[PDB]
C-alpha cells in the first residue's frame, strides 16, 4: 500500500460492489490501500458502519488537509458533500455520477430524463469546482423505457455504475483512461427544481401521457415525493405503477 | 281446538366470501330470533373460482336451470342474493319474495363496480338492500346507506368503506329482511346503469386525452384495486401496459 486511496460514499449498494471487487482483485491492488468514509451531512449512515465505515466531513479546513496529505485518489460514489475548491484541485478527485453528462446534471437525473427525454446512464467524471461537470472517463447510456418508474430506471443506472467500476476500476486507480468534453450545453437540476416537479397543480391541462410521464418520473419505490396539497393542509401523496404484459 | 304457547327456509346465493362468512356468523348471533328458519347457502354455477366458498361448505346453483328455479320455488320461502353473480330470471323473481344486497347506492351506478364509476361521475356510492325485479338493481328499496368518497380514494379503500356499511346494515336488519319487517315504496327515479363493456371501455387508456392533472388522477385511482389488472393502454405490438395509482392522505 504505497498508494492510499479515500472511496467516500454515502451508496451501500455501490460501497459493497467496490469492497468485493478490491476483494477478488487483490492482485491488481497490492500496492494500493482503500480507505472508506461516509459524509457528514448523511441522516442515516448506520447501514454504512457495518462494512466498516466512518464520518469524514470533506467540508472540514482539518479533514481537506489531512486527505490532501495522505490519499494519492479520492473517488465519491454518491457522496452527499460537494467537494470544495481546496480538495479538487490539490488532490486528484473522481465522481461516479448517475447520469449521463452533461444531460440533468445534478439531482436525481432519471426523474427528469423520465419527463424531458434527454439521455441518462452513469458518468465516472473528474471533479472540477463544479457539479457534475468535470472531464468525462468512462459513461454509458441506458435507455428509458415507457413503463419504467424512477426506480426502474435507477436500479438499470446502478447496474451500469458496477458494469463500468468492474471494467475500469483498476484503470481510475492507475489512472489508464482519457480525459473527454461533450460538445453539448447539457443542463444542470438542483433539489429544489425536485420540490417544484413534486408539487402537483390538479389543475394542470396536458395528455395523460404527460401526467403519466409525470407521475412515473416521482414514482420510486416507497419514497412520498408527488403530493397535493388539502385545504387543511394535509397532504395527498400520488404513486403509479407501470407494468408490461406481452 | 287449542294454541300450544311451521320452518321458514332461507336461500342465501352468493359468490363472495366476505359476506358468505359475515352472514352465517351474524345467523349464530341472532339464533334467538331464528328458532324456525334454516338458512342454506350456495354459489353461481358461472363462478369461476368457487374454492373459497366451497371450503365454507357450498355447493353450486344455477338460477338460469329450469330444475334449480322449479326447486328454489318449491322449497324456499326467501332467496336472499349477496353478491350474486346471476341474473334471476323472471319466473324465479315474479314467484318468490327475493332480495339483492347491493354495493351501490340505487338507483346511481347500478350494475357493475359502482364505486369505479362513483370516483369519477362523483354520483353517491353506498350499500342498497331491495326487492329484486326482472330488470338489474331496479327493485324496491328496503334499507340503504351512503358511504362518503374522498380524494384520495381508490376503488378498494371505497368498496372497503362499502363493505362494511354492508356489514352494518346486515348487523341492523337482517331478521327484519327474513320477517318482513321494511317499507318497500317505489322510486320513479330510473338513476343509470354501467354494464360489464362499460367497465371494459374505461380500461383501455387513450395516451392522448387532454385534460386536467385531477381528472387523469380521478380516473387512474377509479381503475386502481388492489392487483387486479384494470387500467392498460395498447402498444403498436399488441402488449398492454397495466397502470395502478395509490393516494395517501398525510395529515
Ligand atoms: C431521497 C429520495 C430519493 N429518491 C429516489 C430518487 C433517487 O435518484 C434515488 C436514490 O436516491 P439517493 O438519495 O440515494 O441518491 P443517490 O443515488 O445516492 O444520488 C443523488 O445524490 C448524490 C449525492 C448525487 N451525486 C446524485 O446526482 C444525486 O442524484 O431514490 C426519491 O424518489 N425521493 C427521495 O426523497
Ligand atoms: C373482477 C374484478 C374486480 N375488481 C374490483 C372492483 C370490484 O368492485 C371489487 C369486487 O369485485 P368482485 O367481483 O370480485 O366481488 P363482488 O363485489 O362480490 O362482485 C360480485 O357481485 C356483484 C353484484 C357482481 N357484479 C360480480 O360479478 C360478483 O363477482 O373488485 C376490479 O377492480 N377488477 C376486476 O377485474
Ligand atoms: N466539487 C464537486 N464536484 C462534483 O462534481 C461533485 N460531485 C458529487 C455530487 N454530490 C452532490 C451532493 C449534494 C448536492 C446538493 O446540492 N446538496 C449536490 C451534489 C460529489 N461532490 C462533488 N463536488
Ligand atoms: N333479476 C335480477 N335482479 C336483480 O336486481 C339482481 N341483482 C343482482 C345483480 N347481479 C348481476 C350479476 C351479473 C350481471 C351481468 O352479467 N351483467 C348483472 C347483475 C343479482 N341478480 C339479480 N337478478
Ligand atoms: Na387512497
Known amino acids: 500500500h504505497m498508494m492510499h486511496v479515500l472511496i467516500v460514499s454515502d451508496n451501500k449498494p455501490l460501497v459493497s460492489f467496490i469492497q468485493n471487487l478490491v476483494a477478488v482483485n487483490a492482485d491488481k491492488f497490492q500496492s494500493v490501500t482503500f480507505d472508506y468514509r461516509y459524509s457528514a451531512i448523511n441522516k442515516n449512515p448506520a447501514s454504512l458502519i457495518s462494512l466498516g465505515l466512518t464520518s469524514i ?41 448517475p447520469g449521463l453528462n452533461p444531460h440533468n446534471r445534478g439531482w436525481f437525473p432519471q426523474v427528469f430524463s423520465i419527463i ?74 438542483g433539489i429544489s427544481d425536485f420540490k417544484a416537479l413534486c408539487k402537483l397543480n390538479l389543475d394542470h391541462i396536458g395528455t395523460l401521457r404527460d401526467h403519466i410521464d ?27 405503477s407501470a407494468e408490461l404484459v406481452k
Not at 67 to 89: G, T
Not at 136 to 164: A, G, H
Open 57 to 97: 466531513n470533506v467540508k472540514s479546513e482539518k479533514d481537506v488537509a489531512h486527505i490532501v496529505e495522505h490519499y494519492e485518489l479520492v473517488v465519491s460514489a454518491h457522496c452527499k458533500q460537494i467537494f470544495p475548491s481546496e480538495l479538487v484541485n490539490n488532490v486528484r478527485c473522481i465522481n461516479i455520477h
Open 116 to 189: 424531458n427525454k434527454k439521455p441518462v446512464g452513469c458518468t465516472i467524471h473528474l471533479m472540477n469546482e463544479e457539479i457534475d461537470d468535470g472531464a468525462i472517463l468512462f459513461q454509458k447510456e441506458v435507455p428509458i423505457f415507457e413503463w419504467d418508474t424512477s426506480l426502474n430506471v435507477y436500479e438499470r443506472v446502478q447496474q451500469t455504475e458496477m458494469d463500468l467500476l468492474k471494467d475500469h476500476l483498476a484503470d481510475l486507480v492507475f489512472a489508464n483512461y482519457q480525459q473527454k468534453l461533450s460538445y453539448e450545453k447539457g443542463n444542470y437540476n
Open 214 to 240: 409525470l407521475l412515473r418520473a416521482l414514482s420510486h419505490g416507497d419514497f412520498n415525493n408527488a403530493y397535493y396539497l388539502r385545504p387543511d393542509g394535509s397532504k395527498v401523496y400520488i404513486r403509479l
